[PDB]
Amino acid sequence: AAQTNAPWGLARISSTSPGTSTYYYDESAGQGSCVYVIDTGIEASHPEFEGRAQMVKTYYYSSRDGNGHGTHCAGTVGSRTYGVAKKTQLFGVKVLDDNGSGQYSTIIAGMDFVASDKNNRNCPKGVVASLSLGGGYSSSVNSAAARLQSSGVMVAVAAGNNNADARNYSPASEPSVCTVGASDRYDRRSSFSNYGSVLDIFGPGTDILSTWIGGSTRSISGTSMATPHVAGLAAYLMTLGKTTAASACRYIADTANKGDLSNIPFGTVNLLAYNNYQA
Ligand SMILES: [Ca+2]
Ligand SMILES: [Ca+2]
């Protein structure tokens, strides 16, 4: 299948070179997989989700996304127009308030919730969790991410936007999950992206168009945006049977575009997420 005039990030993950505008993907499109977006919530009623999104848990007064951030990330995972895996099922877990903030205890609870809740869902091709959040180092937050991964969920997390070594941020610094940096449309490391040996992979993160609240769209930047590209790609690959939740991060790194990025510090991987599609 081919989506013409796609957002640049989608085109980039289906190309060996920058500058293309078509997103090439297998029609299966993540059908049968499930992605939990652990964030500010998801505007499930947005036409772009086609009824495939639902809120399953909130830690605040409402399950509504009053911010936009969660809806944007969910859109990059699985919206019709802006999504990597266009037929996946999306589950929203609201651990961040409408200002985009949350305590570590709540974020941890949200991860442990997903590890249990997945056992109640029909996700035959597998389960992914996308965490576009983080803050300073916490061994408890890292431990929760490790638990979620261990329970059989592919965990993708943002590297952070401090232009620093991600070793000092959580859950970015947990080695067992998939830590995602951001790149721009000219194959440069995004100027804000964290780096370091704990990074597993890069995805598109600068000027990413996706869904927003109020049934709208907008373009924003961050490692928050790169992370759902990788989460969606994992769901897509799991549906194709190419990999499993336990080894998807490794498989994505193995099959990535290598050496394409510039402004990568020595010691950080030069790997860009790639779906290896061939018609
Ligand atoms: Ca290349
Ligand atoms: Ca890792």
Side-chain angles (χ1 to χ4, degrees), residues 12 15-18 187 257-260:
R12 188 65 189 89
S15 183
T16 54
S17 62
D187 279 357
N257 281 310
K258 321 190 172 51
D260 277 356

Side-chain angles (χ1 to χ4, degrees), residues 174-179 198-200 249:
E174 168 53 39
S176 66
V177 304
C178 206
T179 302
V198 73
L199 265 69
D200 293 286
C249 191

Side-chain angles (χ1 to χ4, degrees), residues 7-23:
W8 78 264
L10 300 185
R12 188 65 189 89
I13 70 171
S14 70
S15 183
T16 54
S17 62
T20 70
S21 64
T22 304
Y23 177 36

